[PDB]
Amino acid sequence: DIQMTQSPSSLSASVGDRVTITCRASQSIINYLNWYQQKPGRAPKLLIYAASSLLSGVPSRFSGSGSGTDFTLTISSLQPEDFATYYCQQSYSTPYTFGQGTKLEIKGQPKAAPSVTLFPPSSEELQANKATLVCLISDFYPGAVTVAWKADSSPVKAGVETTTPSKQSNNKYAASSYLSLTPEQWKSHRSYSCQVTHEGSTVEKTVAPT
Amino acid sequence: XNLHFCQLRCKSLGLLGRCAXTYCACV
Amino acid sequence: QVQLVQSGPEVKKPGTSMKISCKASGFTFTRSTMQWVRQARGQRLEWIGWIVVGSGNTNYAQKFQERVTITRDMSTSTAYMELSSLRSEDTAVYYCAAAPVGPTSSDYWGQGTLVTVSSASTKGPSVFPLAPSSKSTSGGTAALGCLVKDYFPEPVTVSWNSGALTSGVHTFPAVLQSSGLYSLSSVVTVPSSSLGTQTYICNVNHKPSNTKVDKRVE
Amino acid sequence: PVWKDADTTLFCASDAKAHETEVHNVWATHACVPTDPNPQEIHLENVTENFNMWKNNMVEQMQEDVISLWDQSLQPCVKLTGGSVIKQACPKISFDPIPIHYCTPAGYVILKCNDKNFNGTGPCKNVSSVQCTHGIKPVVSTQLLLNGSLAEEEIIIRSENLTNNAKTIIVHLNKSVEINCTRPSKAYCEINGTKWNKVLKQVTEKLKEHFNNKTIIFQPPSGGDLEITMHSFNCRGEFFYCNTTQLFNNTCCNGTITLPCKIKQIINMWQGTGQAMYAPKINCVSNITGILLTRDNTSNETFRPGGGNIKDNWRSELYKYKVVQIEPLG
Ligand SMILES: *[C@@H]1O[C@H](CO)[C@@H](O)[C@H](O)[C@H]1NC(C)=O
Ligand SMILES: *[C@@H]1O[C@H](CO)[C@@H](O)[C@H](O)[C@H]1NC(C)=O
Ligand SMILES: *[C@@H]1O[C@H](CO)[C@@H](O)[C@H](O)[C@H]1NC(C)=O
Ligand SMILES: *[C@@H]1O[C@H](CO)[C@@H](O)[C@H](O)[C@H]1NC(C)=O
Ligand SMILES: *[C@@H]1O[C@H](CO)[C@@H](O)[C@H](O)[C@H]1NC(C)=O
Ligand SMILES: *[C@@H]1O[C@H](CO)[C@@H](O)[C@H](O)[C@H]1NC(C)=O
Ligand SMILES: *[C@@H]1O[C@H](CO)[C@@H](O)[C@H](O)[C@H]1NC(C)=O
Ligand SMILES: *[C@@H]1O[C@H](CO)[C@@H](O)[C@H](O)[C@H]1NC(C)=O
Ligand SMILES: *[C@@H]1O[C@H](CO)[C@@H](O)[C@H](O)[C@H]1NC(C)=O
Ligand SMILES: *[C@@H]1O[C@H](CO)[C@@H](O)[C@H](O)[C@H]1NC(C)=O
Q: Which letter does DSSP use for residue C125 in this model?
A: P
Residues A72 and A141 both lie in one domain: no
CB atoms within 10 A of CB C8: 9
Residues C44 and C78 both lie in one domain: yes
Residues A62 and A115 both lie in one domain: no
Residues C134 and C206 both lie in one domain: yes
Any D CB within 8 A of C30 CB: no
SS3 D327: coil
- Which of A109, A126, A151 finishes a domain? A109
Atom of ligand 1 nearest to the CA of D45: 13
CATH number where C139 lies: 2.60.40.10
Contact D32, D13 (CB under 8 A): yes
CA dist A164 and C174 (Å) reads 11
Count of structural domains, chain C: 2
Residues spanned by the domain of C87: 1-119
**Strands D300-305 and D215-218: what pairing?**
parallel
Of D41, A31, D126, nearest to C59 by C-alpha is: D41
Mutate: best of B13, B22, B27, partner D, most D CBs <10 A: B22
Residues A42 and A28 both lie in one domain: yes
Residues C101 and C76 both lie in one domain: yes
Pocket residues for ligand 5 (CB within 6 Å)?
D 178, 180, 285
Return the sign of the alpha-carbon dihedral for residues D214, D290, D55, D114. positive
Give A96 to chain C, closest Cα distance, Å: 6
Any A CB within 8 A of D297 CB: no
- Which of A62, A81, A109 finishes a domain? A109
- Which of C68, C92, C119 finishes a domain? C119
Of A39, A53, A48, nearest to A85 by C-alpha is: A39
Give D281 to chain A, closest Cα distance, Å: 40
Of D139, D143, D202, nearest to D169 by C-alpha is: D143
Q: Determine, for residues A122 and C143 on separate chains, whether the beta-carbon distance falls below 8 Å.
A: no
Q: What residues of D are in the B interface, CB distance below 8 Å?
A: 82, 166, 222-225, 227-228, 268-274, 294, 306-311
C149: left (phi over 0), alpha (psi -120 to 50) or beta: beta
Q: Determine, for residues C143 and A138 on separate chains, whether the beta-carbon distance falls below 8 Å.
A: yes
Q: Determine, for residues D42 and C55 on separate chains, whether the beta-carbon distance falls below 8 Å.
A: yes
Mutate to test the pocket of ligand 5, among D183, D285, D287 (most ligand atoms within 8 A of CB): D285
Contact D58, D8 (CB under 8 A): no
Residues C111 and C195 both lie in one domain: no
Residues C89 and C137 both lie in one domain: no
Residues C175 and C207 both lie in one domain: yes
CA dist D234 and D137 (Å) reads 13
Residues C212 and C129 both lie in one domain: yes
Residue of C nearest to A124 (CA): C128
Contact A4, A33 (CB under 8 A): no
Residues C90 and C129 both lie in one domain: no
Single-letter code of the amino acid located at A78: L
Q: Write the residue in A44, A96, A138 that is nearest to C47 by C-beta.
A: A96
Residues C10 and C115 both lie in one domain: yes
CA dist C156 and C162 (Å) reads 15
Chain D residue numbers with beta carbons less than 8 Å from the beta carbon of B18 are 166, 224
CA dist D148 and D170 (Å) reads 12
Residues A209 and A116 both lie in one domain: yes
Give the distance (Å) from ligand 7 centre to CA of residue D245. Answer: 7
Q: Which letter does DSSP use for residue A182 in this model?
A: -
Residues A90 and A143 both lie in one domain: no
Q: Determine, for residues B22 and D294 on separate chains, whether the beta-carbon distance falls below 8 Å.
A: no
Q: Crossing angle for the helix pair D310-318 and D58-72, nearest 10 degrees? A: 130
CA dist D201 and C2 (Å) reads 61
Residues A38 and A115 both lie in one domain: no
Q: Do you know the residue count of chain B? A: 27
Residues A170 and A198 both lie in one domain: yes
- Which of C64, C94, C119 finishes a domain? C119
- D38-71 in b/e burial notation, b at 16+ Cβ within 10 A? eebebebeebeeebebbebebbebbbebbbebbe
Give B3 to chain D, closest Cα distance, Å: 10
Mutate: best of C95, C96, C104, partner A, most A CBs <10 A: C104
* Sheet of C182-191, strands arranged across: C126-130, C141-151, C182-191, C175-176
Helix (H) or strand (E) holding A34: strand A33-38
Contact C83, C18 (CB under 8 A): yes
CA dist D114 and D307 (Å) reads 27
Contact C57, D42 (CB under 8 A): yes
Count of structural domains, chain A: 2
Residues C194 and C134 both lie in one domain: yes
Does any ligand 1 atom lie closer than 6 A to the CB of residue D46?
Answer: yes
Return the sign of the alpha-carbon dihedral for residues D313, D318, D319, D325. negative
Residues A92 and A126 both lie in one domain: no
Residues A206 and A137 both lie in one domain: yes
Residues A116 and A168 both lie in one domain: yes
- Which of C119, C141, C167 finishes a domain? C119
Atom of ligand 10 nearest to the CA of D137: 13
Residues C114 and C125 both lie in one domain: no
Give A103 to chain D, closest Cα distance, Å: 26
Q: Which letter does DSSP use for residue C89 in this model?
A: G
CA dist D144 and D307 (Å) reads 8
A206: left (phi over 0), alpha (psi -120 to 50) or beta: beta
